[PDB]
């Protein structure tokens, strides 16, 4: 019985931080739903890669709960997540049910916006540290991937594979992660 992941895809999302986790997680046997924040419409990403979501967040939410909620980054992407009442509701409820929340690059800033996982050790893109640390509601980490309980964060496009494999490990265990990793030809 498969684990399930919700990836929330907003306009201006970093497409590498979206696609790498979706792909990697699918390789791990996770049932991934790519949910369009503002509906089923194709989503223009930060570098104009246009991705068609599997459904609207509206509809995806109804098929929940998910074993992980994944927030890709991108400055605008993260801003869009940060402004969404629907996202707030989903994260609050995920935190409540003791489900995993994973955010990369600027993605973690949406956690701050929705008052998620305060007190957690977190990392972000270097550029996003300022925003994330506004209010001192987290302790900051320089690790490529950071996991503090059910709050999993990572730094940027260049940490996307590590982030994704950390999610696999969290959901499916080390052995599965190792299996999936092998053919990726990581360094």
């Amino acid at each position: 019985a498969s684990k399930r992941a919700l990836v929330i895809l907003a306009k201006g999302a970093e497409e590498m931080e979206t696609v790498i986790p979706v792909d990697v997680m699918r390789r791990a046997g996770i049932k991934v739903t790519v949910a369009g924040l503002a509906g089923k419409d194709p989503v223009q990403c930060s570098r104009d890669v246009v991705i068609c979501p599997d459904a609207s967040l509206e509809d995806a939410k109804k098929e929940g709960p998910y074993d992980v909620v994944v927030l890709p980054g991108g400055n605008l992407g993260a801003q869009n997540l940060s402004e969404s009442a629907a996202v707030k509701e989903i994260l609050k409820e995920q935190e409540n049910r003791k489900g995993l929340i994973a955010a990369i690059c600027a993605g973690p800033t949406a956690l701050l916006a929705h008052e998620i996982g305060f007190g957690s050790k977190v990392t972000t893109h270097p550029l996003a540290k300022d925003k994330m640390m506004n209010g001192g509601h987290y302790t900051y980490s320089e690790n490529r991937v950071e996991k503090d309980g059910l709050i999993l964060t990572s730094r940027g496009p260049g940490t996307s594979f590590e982030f994704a494999l950390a999610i696999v490990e969290a959901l499916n265990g080390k052995e599965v992660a190792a299996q999936v990793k092998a053919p990726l030809v990581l360094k």
């Binding site: 990392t123 270097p126 550029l127 540290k129 300022d130 980490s141 320089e142 690790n143 490529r144 730094r155």
Partner: protein
């Protein structure tokens, strides 16, 4: 054709052409700062006595394929140093 104005017209386009090169240069190595006054777990003082001693992997392996292309300048020069030899029938 005129001895060097062949390369003094072709050079004018390492000036039309290679213009868009250091133009980037200036255009782009001026904001080190940006992430500067920021802190990144990519430099911790083994990415210095390591994170420096491995950017050999990509810079190392230019010159397998520039085996020829910094040596194909040791192709085309000393055949003007035989438009030196046939010329000291004349020059001197």
């Amino acid at each position: 054709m005129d001895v060097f104005m062949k390369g003094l017209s072709k050079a004018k386009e390492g000036v039309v052409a290679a213009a868009e090169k250091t133009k980037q240069g200036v255009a782009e190595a001026a904001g080190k700062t940006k992430e500067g006054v920021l802190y990144v777990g990519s430099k911790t003082k083994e990415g210095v006595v390591h994170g420096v001693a491995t950017v050999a992997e990509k810079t190392k392996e230019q010159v397998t394929n520039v085996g020829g292309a910094v040596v194909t300048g040791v192709t085309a020069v000393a055949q003007k140093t035989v438009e030196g030899a046939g010329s000291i029938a004349a020059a001197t």
